[PDB]
Every structure is written in C-alpha cells, then in structure tokens.
C-alpha cells in the first residue's frame, strides 16, 4: 500500500474573465467546504469549534489565478474563514500565530515548499492597514484590485513587492474571499463590482459588518428564541447607526458564524 502525506481541499477562482456566476459559484463552494456536517443555529451554519477540531480538517485552500496566468494559494482557517498564510511558487508565508497551538497547526500547511516564512505581525485589519498606509475605507475593491493583488503576492518572493503593497494585497484578498464567505451582503457588494466592472472602496456599512462578525455570532447564539439580550448597532451606507434586536433581521445578511 502507498502512504501519502495528507492534503487540504482546494477551491479555484480566477479573475481572468470573471463573471457574476463564476464569483458566486466560488463563494458557494468556499461556504460548502467550510460547513460540511456543520451545526446550524437559527438557519445559520456555525463554523467548527477550534477546540477538538482535528488538524487534518483545520484548513481549506483557495487557489487564485489571474489574467497574468499566475497562481497563489491562500490558506483559510475553517474555524473563522480567515486567511492564515499563502503559497507562491516554492515559498510559503504565514501571519504570526496567536498562540502555540495555532503555531503548531500551520506547520501542516504547504508541506511541499522549500522556503517557509513567518511574518512578525498578525493578519488582523488594524495591523495590515498600518503597514499598507491606508484604511479599508480608502482601499478599492473589485476584480481589478484582486487581479493586481494576486500578482503582488506572487512577486513578493522576487523583491518586486514591498511589505506595504503586500499588506494592501492581503486587505483586498481577505475582504473579497473571507468576508464575502461570511456575509451574503459583502458577497453581493463584490458581485456588483464585477457586474459593472468597476472598483470602489467599501462603504461604512461593509466595514462595520466586518468589524461586527464576532459580536453578531455571539448575539445570535446567545439569543432567546431569536431575540437578542441587548441590541447590536450596525451602520447604514451613509454612516448613520441603526439597531438590530432579532436574529430574523440577520438571516439575509450573514452566511456563517463563528462558534460561540
């Protein structure tokens, strides 16, 4: 019998000739690989609990290609749908782990590369915005930005990309993949940019949703037959705040929740 090293599943997406259908198909496939056999609470799938999750089920891979015919593979943690690192050619790069258990988990990613690197910084938006020199509100998203971001990640091993541009490229990828997988609303925002072949920065309603995912997951899972103990404040597109008191309002907005 032959013994093979273990593999994590790969989902493909290309910006080359991307359409509303190809992007929607990609996000649906990512969600499907995140939620196999998952628990569902108030119609919303819950991602696996990090505690007790076997290492051979901890990650999924997103292989991104572009019109330049380059390929980079991002690793997503299935417990929060977030990017933990990427591979380009014969090199892999990882955000600084938050703890020693997560540091051990990432050693199982990209076990065919000859060069492995860990950034001293983590991958949260605050830090990446600092390195990029721009907030999310001033970084345009769309197929154009993603096309360029894939090239920038690829060329980081060759010296053609410096860290600020790399951080900007992560901000683009994370929002167009991780946040779109988490939120039907952000999926639609990205699909509309593709539909019109335009790029534009995310408005305050998108940013606040991103910042609120953990708290929304908590409120839903702690609710009393769908009613929140305390209302959650979100933002409209014009920046004004509004309150949400019930899971039923979040059902069209959210697609996945972190385990609580």
């Amino acid at each position: 019998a032959m013994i093979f090293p273990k593999q994590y599943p790969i989902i493909n997406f290309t910006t080359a000739g991307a359409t509303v259908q190809s992007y929607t198909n990609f996000i649906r496939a990512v969600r499907g690989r995140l939620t196999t056999g998952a628990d569902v609470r108030h119609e919303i799938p819950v991602l696996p609990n990090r505690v007790g999750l076997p290492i051979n089920q901890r990650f999924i891979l997103v292989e991104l290609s572009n019109h330049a015919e380059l390929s980079v593979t991002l690793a997503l943690d299935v417990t929060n749908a977030y990017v933990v690192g990427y591979r380009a050619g014969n090199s892999a790069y990882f955000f600084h782990p938050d703890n020693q258990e997560d540091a051990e988990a990432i050693t199982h990613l990209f076990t065919d590369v000859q060069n492995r690197y860990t950034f001293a910084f983590g991958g949260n938006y605050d830090r990446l915005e600092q390195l990029a020199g721009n907030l999310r509100e001033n970084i345009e998203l769309g197929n154009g930005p993603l096309e360029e971001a894939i090239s920038a990640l690829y060329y980081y091993s060759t010296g053609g990309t410096q860290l600020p541009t790399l951080a900007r490229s992560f901000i683009i990828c994370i929002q167009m993949i991780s946040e779109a997988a988490r939120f039907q609303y952000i999926e639609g925002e990205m699909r509309t940019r593709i539909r019109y072949n335009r790029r534009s920065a995310p408005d305050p309603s998108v940013i606040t949703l991103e910042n609120s995912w953990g708290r929304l997951s908590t409120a839903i899972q702690e609710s009393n037959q769908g009613a929140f103990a305390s209302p959650i404040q979100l933002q409209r597109r014009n920046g004004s705040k509004f309150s949400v008191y019930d899971v039923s309002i979040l059902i069209p907005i959210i697609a996945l929740m972190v385990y609580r």
Partner: nanobody, 124 residues
Framework: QVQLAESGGGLVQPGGSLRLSCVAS???????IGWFRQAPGKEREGVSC????????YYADSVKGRFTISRDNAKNTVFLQMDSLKPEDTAVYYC??????????????????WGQGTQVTVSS
C-alpha cells in the same frame, strides 16, 4: 441592468390565495428581490425579501406564515405565495431588485430597480 415585471394579482374573497410573480429580464442574475405594497393614500411598506444566492428570506410581521417567498433561478422568477388573504392586504404589490439587499430589506429607497406593480384586491 435588469427589468422587472409583476403578474398574478386579482380579486379574491377573504381566505383566498394568489401567487405573485416577479420576472426579471434578461436574467435574475443573483439579485435579491424585495416585495412591497401600497394602498391608496397610505405609505408603501415592505412585505418580504429573498437573497440572491442562498435564498434566505425575511417577512414583515403582518404577513408571516401566510405569505411565502421563493426563488426560481431557472425561470428567472421570484414568487410570492399569498394565503389566507384579508381585506387589509388590498394594495398594489411591487417587486424591487438590489444586489445586495439593503441591510433592512424593507428600506425601499435603497433598491435599484422596480416593477410596475400588480393589483391585489380582497373583498370585505
């Protein structure tokens, strides 16, 4: 772009049923769809909504249980099944399209495309 056209309205007695259709041309194209209604001299009000790729639904309290919204991508149609109709349901019903739906999907001002409406009348 997208163009929307409603059909399926009519006159029914209390307890009757109607199935409204919101047909998108050339294609529904993963747009979310919201249904609204307006009676003479009253404000428009959102009734129900459905998202474009997961078919997640929302209903105003006044129509929960009685009304069911569903999406048929193959027919490029979103349906609103209206059961146990009441006189108070009399109105012109409109469908509207947005991608994504507004965060509160009864916010009609944020939708981008509207149909011309279909009349629903329930006898007293």
């Amino acid at each position: 772009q997208v163009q929307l056209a409603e059909s399926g309205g009519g006159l029914v007695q209390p307890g009757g049923s109607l199935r409204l259709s919101c047909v998108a041309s050339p294609s529904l194209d993963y747009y979310g769809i919201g249904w609204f209604r307006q009676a003479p001299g009253k404000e428009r009000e959102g009734v129900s909504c459905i998202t474009g790729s997961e078919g997640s639904t929302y209903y105003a309290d006044s129509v929960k249980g009685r009304f069911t919204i569903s999406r048929d991508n193959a027919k490029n149609t979103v349906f609103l099944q209206m059961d146990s109709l009441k006189p108070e349901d009399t109105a012109v019903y409109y469908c509207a399209a947005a991608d994504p739906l507004p965060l509160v999907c009864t916010w009609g001002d944020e939708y981008d495309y509207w149909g011309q409406g279909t009349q629903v009348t329930v006898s007293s």
